[PDB]
Amino acid sequence: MAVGILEVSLISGKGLKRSDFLGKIDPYVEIQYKGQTRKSSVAKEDGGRNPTWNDKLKWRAEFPGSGADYKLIVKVMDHDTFSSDDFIGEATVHVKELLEMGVEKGTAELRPTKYNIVDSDLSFVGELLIGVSYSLLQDRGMDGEQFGGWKHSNVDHHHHHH
Template sequence: MQVMDPLTSPKIGGNHLFCYALLFILIASHVSLSASARELKVEPKGSVKDLVQSSKATKIKRTVNGLLEVVLVDAKGLKDTERFSGGMDPYVMIKYKTQERNSPVAKGAGSKPVWNKRFSFRVQYPDYAGGNGYKLILKLMDKDSFTADDFIGETVIYVEDLLVLGAEKGKYQMLPTKYRVVGSNKKYNGEIRVGLSFTPIR
């Protein structure tokens, strides 16, 4: 059987040549698209960490003043410092750089105090003054009437990521989250639940 060359055969007219040329173009295009598809990478939807890295990469070029709000919800599993006088009266000293706020005393609440209070701090980002980086320090204390207040434990929350996202997006909020309370012996001493938000002031 003789194989006919479609390009040189005298029996194939102009229309046939056009069809073969079109077929050749379609095949070449398909191969090119397939190669491109293999090279295409679909990135997953960004996490908060990805958003922060992206925000830091763009580098906020001006100082942003804003309001850091701390919602002090409650605490659980606190080690009782009042073994003989019956029940703790916990409160929280909240510190950001040079600013300090004190929560109300949860009278007789023991190891499960509830506050549900909101506190505000004026902050800047970027801010290299005041020391302590971007740390929010929560010191849990037991109120005593006749002696010095007893230290229950401490929690440190790093809020730089919150400030970065709030500065770029106009506002950023973190729902109440549980944080470990560390006692004076550096061991676990319960947990505290805190919500955070940062809103730039225009």
């Protein structure tokens, strides 16, 4: 139950899905000097080659609705013996617990844990960076700086017999 703007880091991301022609035009950075700004749309299929400080993404968030207990979303990760180190990521999945905890003190931030983002049974998760926190605000600024990147591919196996 919190209404504010969300923050995302433009680290990396894999686009398992397609769209109406995906080239070097769709994936645009948020750069402007007038008044309004635009956030980079979905990933253009494996675009982690780019940095993270390149730019940030913001979106409007509103109170999801009192849940009153229920909904764990904390028991859907991997490697749980005491305290895992490696982390996978987080995708568009039931996680209002983060934005809802924001209104508590005015701001919220995901806890230090490897959330769920692997193809299993949640919401068709994929690949994303961890750190997307939520805070109470509505002053969508602009910021950003000119930049770009590129990509090709990356595949290989390990077979020395039949």
